[PDB]
Amino acid sequence: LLRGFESSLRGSRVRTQIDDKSFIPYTWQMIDVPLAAAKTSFIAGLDTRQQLA
């Protein structure tokens, strides 16, 4: 009780307790939905300046 008590000594206040772990699992939201992507020939068009007949 008087000597076996844990004190907030050096080594426990190191910055690596925060900087070594990334904040990605605490802020990111679960998606589980696939992302889209489409060809450039789908949004722009077919470029009607081709041949004639």
């Binding site: 008087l2 008590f5 925060i18």
Partner: protein, 434 residues
């Protein structure tokens, strides 16, 4: 009548009353243990007087202790309006020692800050009636004041200190009495000839337990989750009439902290957290020809008029990263207390909680400073451009400015309240963490 409502029932009610779990019309009271509570006077060691240090040892009369009230008897050294919570000013500090270990410590300013933030309504009013003269008393009036202590065991029976489980350890209270008390033995810097020395008595309310409960406390180990106060004084980045002072203070704090609290003050006048001004109540004689913006209306030292406060804005930074966006001084004065306490905080007193409900006993979120290298409180001050002797200048002015007399608030008091564990075993106690 009422039947017309009972019949008004359908699917939308199922979530509220289907497969009912409770009623409101039948209470089961819980059988409790057998106990009794007695108020017993402690002996004060040392010599009671202004500026003296005294102490008391808590006698083993009962098994557990809770409330502690320190009585003081003071006589007015001047007329009504010359004092401000003088019994609070008198009890300069109190230190709690268990087994020779320093467990906690309060300061007169904490009692004032604590009150400003956490007491309220008629609790606060009744509280002032016990530490001041509030019925327009005149010089020579004598009153006994009752100053409750606010250590963890002095607030709830849930944390009653089990003296019974501490057979080997003394529990002591060390008190420092102020060298001066306003309106009692001094008036500003002047001494009051003829003022009486205080009479003091410390009362401890002890719980007597029956056999089964007493035995369990005496023999079983315990871990009491308690709160402690941390406090350091700092020099204020003294406000100026020419610019906005700023300050960044690394806080030497530790442990899971439920909240930080702070104030700026004029160390000359107990409880003065705001600037003096010639507006009603803001200075001695305010509102008339005799008004002086160099001395407060002591009986009205505290105020809700934020114009006289000096904090423009603040933030807390942890290890280089902002903990929250910078907010205005009025956030910390009005919103924090609205959200976290439900009381009304005087201008010049600020609070920032890390807890959902910091006013309670149950932990509800803490900031552990034992894992933070650089906990810094960033303070931006208002510009003291207002001529305090002209009420129009004060009452009609802007958000970012204050009184020229605000530069007198040169002391900064920063407090923190945290949780720790008071372990008790085999007749002895002490803290789990330092």
């Amino acid at each position: 009548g009422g039947l017309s409502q009972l019949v008004a029932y359908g699917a939308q009610d199922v979530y509220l009353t289907g497969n009912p779990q409770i009623t409101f019309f039948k209470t089961v009271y819980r059988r409790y243990t057998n106990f009794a509570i007695e108020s017993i006077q402690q002996t004060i060691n040392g010599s009671v007087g202004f500026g003296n240090k005294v102490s008391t040892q808590i006698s083993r009369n009962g098994d557990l202790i809770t409330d502690i009230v320190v009585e003081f008897v003071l006589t007015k050294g001047g007329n009504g309006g010359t004092t401000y919570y003088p019994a609070e000013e008198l009890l300069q500090d109190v230190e709690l020692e268990i087994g020779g270990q320093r467990i906690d410590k309060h300061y007169n300013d904490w009692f004032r800050t604590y009150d400003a933030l956490f007491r309220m309504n008629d609790d606060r009013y009744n509280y002032r009636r016990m530490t001041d003269w509030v019925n327009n008393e005149l010089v020579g009036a004598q009153k006994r004041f009752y100053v409750p202590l606010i250590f963890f065991f002095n607030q709830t029976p849930g944390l009653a200190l089990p003296l019974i489980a501490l057979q080997y350890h003394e529990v002591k209270l060390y008190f420092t009495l102020a060298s001066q008390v306003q309106g009692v033995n001094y008036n500003g810097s002047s001494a009051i000839a003829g003022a009486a020395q205080p009479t003091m008595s410390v009362w401890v309310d002890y719980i007597f337990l029956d056999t089964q409960e007493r035995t369990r406390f005496a023999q079983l180990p315990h871990e009491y989750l308690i709160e402690q106060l941390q406090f350091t004084g700092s020099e204020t980045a003294t406000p100026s009439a020419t610019t906005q002072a700023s300050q960044n203070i690394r806080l030497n704090f530790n442990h899971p902290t439920k909240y930080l609290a702070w104030n700026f003050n004029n160390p000359t006048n107990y409880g003065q957290y705001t600037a003096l001004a010639n507006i009603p109540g803001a200075c001695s004689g305010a509102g008339t020809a005799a008004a002086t913006v160099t001395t407060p209306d002591y009986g009205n030292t505290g105020t809700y008029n934020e114009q006289l406060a000096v904090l423009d804005s603040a933030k807390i930074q942890l290890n280089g990263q902002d903990r929250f966006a910078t907010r205005k001084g009025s956030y910390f004065n009005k919103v924090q207390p609205y959200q976290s306490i439900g009381g009304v905080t005087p201008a010049g007193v600020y609070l920032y909680s890390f807890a959902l409900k910091p006013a309670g006993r149950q932990p509800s979120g803490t900031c552990n400073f034992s894992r933070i290298d650089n906990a810094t409180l960033s303070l931006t001050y208002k510009t003291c451009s207002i001529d305090a002797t002209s009420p129009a200048a004060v009452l009609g002015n802007t958000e970012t400015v204050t009184a020229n007399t605000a530069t007198l608030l040169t002391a900064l008091n920063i407090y923190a309240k945290n949780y720790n564990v008071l372990r008790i075993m085999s007749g002895m106690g002490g803290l789990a963490y330092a």
